[PDB]
Write a protein that binds this DNA or RNA. Structure first.
Ligand SMILES: [Mg+2]
Ligand SMILES: [Mg+2]
Length: 341
DNA sequence: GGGGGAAGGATTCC
DNA sequence: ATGGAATCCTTCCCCC
């Protein structure tokens, strides 16, 4: 087995530079605007003309408008990018039968019985990377090696517009050598939790006790971080399927009142419930985000699927329950839907 | 002790 | 200040 992964360069920033090319060349910032204050919100994607001056997914729109005030500010057009993305999902599968769609902007492939070798890898990788563009005007980064994870790194350190090759010699050579905060799945928090455990790389996971790893990360990551310090890992292109569908919104005011919380809430449902189309959720969850900026949700499963009425109904129920075991002030309030038939 | 879940918080990504 | 859709992982309880 051998895996090629392909990522979509700053997806969102780009779809929009295919819809309006007068955009290309210049700074571009897709964001998510709240209602709170004029231009209230967070950046969501930015191209390199933006990222390069400090503007990145995460940051308040206002502390962007600070750094590059004459950037093009665009609201988030999600659906518009899901479809485009899917058009490219099927062109990808135009090569592979066992495709793995990791997210709207990422997906892995077993070029296995298709390509045996890094000659005929870099070849066909590139193969697809001009076709995605030609047939769609959209640009990626492809990367090569033995497993999922190891391909993502290939892509991560060559993106954007890039093609990474990685000898199963360097699968190792990485381990010993590479920073570990750069591990698919390893964020700030775990990276953090990890130098306190002494670990700065992969290989360094074989020193330290493992039952001490346990409560520091969980066996989860544990074994996971461990298998990769072996050259093994070797885990196969699953299919994968949306598990949850949610939609979370933000209210013109922190609040604790139900007739004040219901409309936002009830909106989340409509929105979530139209994104469901053809799936029956066996479980719901309302997720409020504390005043003081912490999450507090409250799920519930049932022995069948949930009709919007039920969804409407249990939802207030989850919501009060939350106004109980708590009493700050709920700013953002929303809903997920899980265990689909 | 643990299988089999459901509930809840926490962490990752963009 | 701090959007958001989504998953991941810990603990809880039920009962064999
Ligand atoms: Mg991307
Ligand atoms: Mg990271």
């Amino acid at each position: 087995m051998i895996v090629l992964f392909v990522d979509f360069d700053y997806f969102y920033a780009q779809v929009e530079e295919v819809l309006n090319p007068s955009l290309k060349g210049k700074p571009v910032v897709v964001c998510v605007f709240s209602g709170r204050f004029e231009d209230s919100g967070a950046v969501a994607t930015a191209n390199y003309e933006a990222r390069k001056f400090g503007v990145k997914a995460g940051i308040p729109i206002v502390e962007a408008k600070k750094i590059l005030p004459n950037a093009v500010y665009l609201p988030m057009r999600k659906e518009v990018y899901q479809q485009v993305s899917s058009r490219i999902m099927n062109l990808l599968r135009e090569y592979s039968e066992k495709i793995e769609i990791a997210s709207i902007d990422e997906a892995y492939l077993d070029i296995s019985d298709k390509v045996r070798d890094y000659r005929e890898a870099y070849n066909l990788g590139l193969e697809i990377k001009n076709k995605i563009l030609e047939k769609e005007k959209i640009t990626v980064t492809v990367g090569i090696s033995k497993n999922k994870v190891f391909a993502k790194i290939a892509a991560d350190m060559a993106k954007p517009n890039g093609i990474k090759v990685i000898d199963d010699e360097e699968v190792k050579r990485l381990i010993r050598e590479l920073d570990i905060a750069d591990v698919p799945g390893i964020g700030n928090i775990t990276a953090e939790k990890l130098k306190k455990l002494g670990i700065n790389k992969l290989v360094d996971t074989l020193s330290i006790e493992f039952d001490k790893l346990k409560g520091m990360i969980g066996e989860a990551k544990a074994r996971y971080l461990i298998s990769l310090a072996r050259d093994e890992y070797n885990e196969p292109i699953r299919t994968r399927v949306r598990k949850s569908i949610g939609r979370i919104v933000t209210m013109k005011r922190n609040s604790r009142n139900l007739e004040e919380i219901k409309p936002y809430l009830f909106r989340a449902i409509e929105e979530s419930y139209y994104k469901l189309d053809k799936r029956i959720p066996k479980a719901i969850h309302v997720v409020a985000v504390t005043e003081d900026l912490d999450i507090v949700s409250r799920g519930r499963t049932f022995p069948h699927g949930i009709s919007k009425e039920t969804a409407y109904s249990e939802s207030v129920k989850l919501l009060q329950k939350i106004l109980e075991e708590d009493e700050r002030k709920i700013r953002r309030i929303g809903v997920r839907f899980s265990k689909f038939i």
